[PDB]
Design an enzyme around this catalytic site. Structure first.
Site, PDB file in Angstrom:
ATOM      1  N   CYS A  15      82.724  60.753  62.254  1.00  0.00           N
ATOM      2  CA  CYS A  15      81.488  60.937  61.508  1.00  0.00           C
ATOM      3  C   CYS A  15      80.580  59.717  61.646  1.00  0.00           C
ATOM      4  O   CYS A  15      81.047  58.611  61.919  1.00  0.00           O
ATOM      5  CB  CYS A  15      81.803  61.202  60.037  1.00  0.00           C
ATOM      6  SG  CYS A  15      80.357  61.247  58.951  1.00  0.00           S
TER       7      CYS A  15
ATOM      8  N   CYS B 151      79.428  57.572  57.494  1.00  0.00           N
ATOM      9  CA  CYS B 151      80.641  57.636  56.687  1.00  0.00           C
ATOM     10  C   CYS B 151      80.974  56.270  56.087  1.00  0.00           C
ATOM     11  O   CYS B 151      81.701  56.178  55.101  1.00  0.00           O
ATOM     12  CB  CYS B 151      81.816  58.130  57.533  1.00  0.00           C
ATOM     13  SG  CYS B 151      82.199  57.075  58.951  1.00  0.00           S
TER      14      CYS B 151
END
Length: 103
Positions: free
Chosen positions: A30, A33
């Protein structure tokens, strides 16, 4: 304060009878994050009674699978070494109330 988890031997104590701990199972991948790490900490000022830890989906990829949490990121709540709630998303709206009604 705020800290992450690399070994279950650690997080295992966090929950084990210690109020409501807000651990995030952010995906090892991600993009945005890591921006949560500082946030996860900012909440520790409003609910100092509750511990704001963080889970590693890379090192503890299992704990992310055990609870069926592979999002990116995700919020997991646990009361007295047990569970309470799980809301994937620490967006200013639930991550706050989730720590209130619970803790």
């Amino acid at each position: 304060m705020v800290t992450q988890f690399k070994t279950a031997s650690e997080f295992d104590s966090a929950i084990a009878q210690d109020k409501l701990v807000v651990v995030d199972f952010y995906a090892t991948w991600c993009g945005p994050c890591k921006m949560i790490a500082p946030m996860i900490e900012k909440f520790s000022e409003q609910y100092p009674q509750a511990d704001f830890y963080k889970l590693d989906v890379d090192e503890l990829g299992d704990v992310a699978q055990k609870n069926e949490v592979s999002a990116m990121p995700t919020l997991l709540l646990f009361k007295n070494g047990k569970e309470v709630a799980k809301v994937v998303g620490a967006n200013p709206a639930a991550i706050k109330q989730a720590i209130a009604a619970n803790a």
